[PDB]
Amino acid sequence: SPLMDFFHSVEGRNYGELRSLTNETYQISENVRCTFLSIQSDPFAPGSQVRLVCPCTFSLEKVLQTTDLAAANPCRRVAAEDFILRSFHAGYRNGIPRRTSGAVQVLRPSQHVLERSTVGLVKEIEIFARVKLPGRRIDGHGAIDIFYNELVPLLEQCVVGLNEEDLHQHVICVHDQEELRSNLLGAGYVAFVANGAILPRDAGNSDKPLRDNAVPFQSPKSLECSFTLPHSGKTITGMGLPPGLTLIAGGGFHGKSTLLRALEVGIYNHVPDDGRTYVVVDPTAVKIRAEDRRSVHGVDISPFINNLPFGKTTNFFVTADASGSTSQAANIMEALELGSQLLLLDEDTCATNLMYRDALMQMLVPRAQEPITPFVERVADLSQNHGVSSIMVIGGSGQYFPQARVVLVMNAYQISDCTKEAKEIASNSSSVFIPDVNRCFDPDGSFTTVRTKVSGIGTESIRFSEETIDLSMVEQIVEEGQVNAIAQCLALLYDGERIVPEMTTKGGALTQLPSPGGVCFNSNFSSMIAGCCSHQHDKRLELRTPSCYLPRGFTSATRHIEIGAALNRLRTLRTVT
Amino acid sequence: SPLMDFFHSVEGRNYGELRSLTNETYQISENVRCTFLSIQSDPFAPGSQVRLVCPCTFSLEKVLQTTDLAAANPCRRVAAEDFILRSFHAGYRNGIPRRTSGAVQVLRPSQHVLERSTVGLVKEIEIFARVKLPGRRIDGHGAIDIFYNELVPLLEQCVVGLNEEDLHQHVICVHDQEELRSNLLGAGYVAFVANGAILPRDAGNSDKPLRDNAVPFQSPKSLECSFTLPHSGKTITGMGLPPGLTLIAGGGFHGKSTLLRALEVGIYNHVPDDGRTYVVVDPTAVKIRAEDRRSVHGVDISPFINNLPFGKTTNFFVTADASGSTSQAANIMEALELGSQLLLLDEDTCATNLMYRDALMQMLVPRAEPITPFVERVADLSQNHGVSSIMVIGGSGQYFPQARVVLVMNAYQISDCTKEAKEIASNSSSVFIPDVNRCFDPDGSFTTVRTKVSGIGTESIRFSEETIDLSMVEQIVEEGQVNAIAQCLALLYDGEPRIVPEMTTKGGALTQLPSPGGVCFNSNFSSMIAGCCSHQHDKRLELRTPSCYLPRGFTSATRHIEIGAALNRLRTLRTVT
């Protein structure tokens, strides 16, 4: 009631008047309360941050399995908050807002279920928003619409008026997914692909499942295996993949890349639509690709590449313009340093030189003269002595056959288990890694340059003061709120110049890190980044550290490996050993 | 004079009266004049478009070799306007402006010399700009600063007060530079790389040459050749590449991607620093890569990929989400139909399946294997259609029997090893229709649109609600180029009915297209795109087709092939045969 009357009150009057609202809290409905987090300078300044608060109607016991909030499995708290976001957002598609100024920015959820700062379940329901409040004169009627006519009905009908059965099933599917990824290394696998999974996406620029003429994934028998889901009781069946080397071989339009992308997202749980639901991978899995002109600092790529020009150091690599082989190797070590157990390779984004060696090529120029020691030679070593496994798509090269654990053959989106035939083909055709990695972070040479503000640019980049970090090929980033999280971390690392050691220890301390779902090889770089991640988790995916330029509640969880990767490619980065 | 005397008058007054400034044209100095092409609505709005006019002081005789404007070689006209802007911009680093509002937006030219609408030479000098005229009570003093203090000294000192000896030398390098490529197909070559060239760049995110410890290009003797530049008299020497197949072989970190990138830009002339200056390629050459999830419509990918799943037609291919080989082959023909003469490949960003087939792969599963690799179509394409290929190969000597020359690179030093290489092979040892039927269908193509077309940086096109991915069309090298493409799309759309057949004709008529420097296999698609390019050229890089959201003078020339690639991968592209 009173907010409106207030606005009538200030309806004509000048814009400055608005700075009164901030902090000033009003109840706009019986079941809705509004709290003002900021009030911006003008209409065109991006949003005026507000906290929408409304009662939590559903039974915790039925959906969260406990009466007291604090006991609830965080996974289910996430799936809940995730769901509410989804429901509120769908409210626009169901013509619920009697009016749609469209000046209401609230973070849009991916197809993946991540903890987001956006909705918090507290004891109530906490939804953060950004609103473009309506000439120089104020125009209260605009706002008046915006709250009473657009937000209240959406809240009351899609948020307060939730559907419990839907909620409960959301949460059950999600949780069963987490648990099912928690069962992986135990059950004997590194990846599991559920039967009937609709892997292929809707469009090359789309993440939703394929509506038309999808072919449900079917595991070969020899690779078939089953599980029991705890919360649904549903028992499911599919393709299990042992530790070691999984080869995905077929030449054509067959589905190879499509399966693999499923596996990269395999570290996520997605809304029951997604159709990749219950395709799961080790939660530390990393899409490994050549990436070029990326900068490297302090990575020891010496396992793969041996003989740089001009006696330049393999063992502590450093460039601001990297090669396809060198940076791919850079990414493999970058990864191991952050502790990945399952590398994911799509050969078409991989640096052929790294991958294998041609006879003609070696005889043309002697391999003594060639630096590179290809991946095939390091792979058996990595699985046997390190428990690091690889799944990779190979297009037309059987060189990997003596090393291959399984050889898959994809044809028109159908798989066959051809591991026997292939190693038979191989047949008739016939460690090196330091886990304790000496890499500390140097905030001095790293941050000397800058002049600030830190902010996430879409899904692609980080505005880091005058600097700009390119994540366009950190392919497992799948939300804007993720890169935003990363921005929070960077602005933190920057702001407190006690923290590197402090976070390094904060990290060495931990036994398990948070998955982006909420559920819980070393070095000081690694461990530090773990410290940052962990601290961020602590403060509810919202560090506020001063140099950060971010709205309240547009942040999504992300693995520590991603914060790793983002710093890892700061091109002002400096690092010591 | 009069402008400021106006402004203070206004300075209390409301922003609106700035709508008086429209059209009204003022002289803020002897050698300066400004014309207001627009006025922003708001202080925020991206700026207010103005024409900056100043006298042409230099002797046209020495620089353009004619007293009369209209005779001037457009190559030297471009190099002129290029140089003018460049100095103007340099005016900021030389402490020239008295004040620095930074409300002045004027296109930043790249290292490339391109025709740009920004500076025009007419009879004088024409520079287009965008200004943010500053509380929302007018900031008359602020504006006064922008013009009396910032723009004028820049103009008078760096533009009116230009340096003719440099400008002359600019133009000589540029012109001599264009001529050197015109000489290429004649002199018997497809690529020429000048000795002493500095190929590599300062940083993975930078286009400027490698300042520190660059190693100068040197041609192997066997491939060495020389030319004579008409305008400088200078005689230059380097690496000549014949028609046919050139293989770039090597190990790692030796500079192949460096050389190749130089060759991709080889369709451009660079400001005399750039250091790739006098590296030239066929001005039609295209960087061919696997581009995944790109949409295809109407491409006959048949020569490489003869089979698909489900009787899907290779001969008229269509996907909204695409494969590495499938996309790459689309690219090869997309480019062929637009008339490429040299295909440029980095075996790394190429889809390997398209490139060779392993013995082991072929046996494990027989080829009766959609794909027919490039190695087989290469001789054919060369011999029968005069389309050549230079490609970086990482470790596969399979191409050796097909190889014209085999280049071996080692620590930034090339060697001719084609003898030894083909021996290696010896020791271990048409299809394409030029007449491709592809008409453009504006009906199905433009149905879903409500508009506005605007280029997003260098990377994408906001085509109404649609978005086009130019992120892997690697030879786009300016924002003004993407803006150009946006102009053309806005044209095909707004002038929809008669513009397709008309441009098709307007393009069949043409025996030469305009190179981006200004100097001057068929299908209706192609001929149409050529029509668009040529009409754009005619119209001075300013087609204000009505649905174009663009400031005046933020446009740069492109090849026709580029406009081809953008339309080509529109996700609502419908095309008929």
Ligand SMILES: Nc1ncnc2c1ncn2[C@@H]1O[C@H](COP(=O)(O)OP(=O)(O)NP(=O)(O)O)[C@@H](O)[C@H]1O
């Ligand atoms: N199981 C499926 N059902 C329906 N469509 C599919 C399926 N799998 C893949 N697709 C579509 O097939 C197209 C090509 O599949 P893709 O995943 O690229 O095969 P691929 O092996 O990567 N070929 P390549 O990378 O060229 O060697 C993509 O558009 C997919 O969306």
Ligand SMILES: Nc1ncnc2c1ncn2[C@@H]1O[C@H](COP(=O)(O)OP(=O)(O)NP(=O)(O)O)[C@@H](O)[C@H]1O
């Ligand atoms: N003339 C030069 N002077 C100095 N540095 C150079 C020169 N040419 C190349 N480089 C460096 O080498 C890198 C490019 O070479 P690169 O692409 O690694 O060769 P490559 O071995 O063919 N690639 P790959 O085989 O895929 O690893 C750049 O990052 C440059 O820094």
Ligand SMILES: [Mg+2]
């Ligand atoms: Mg390279």
Ligand SMILES: [Mg+2]
């Ligand atoms: Mg390379």
Ligand SMILES: [Mg+2]
């Ligand atoms: Mg693919």
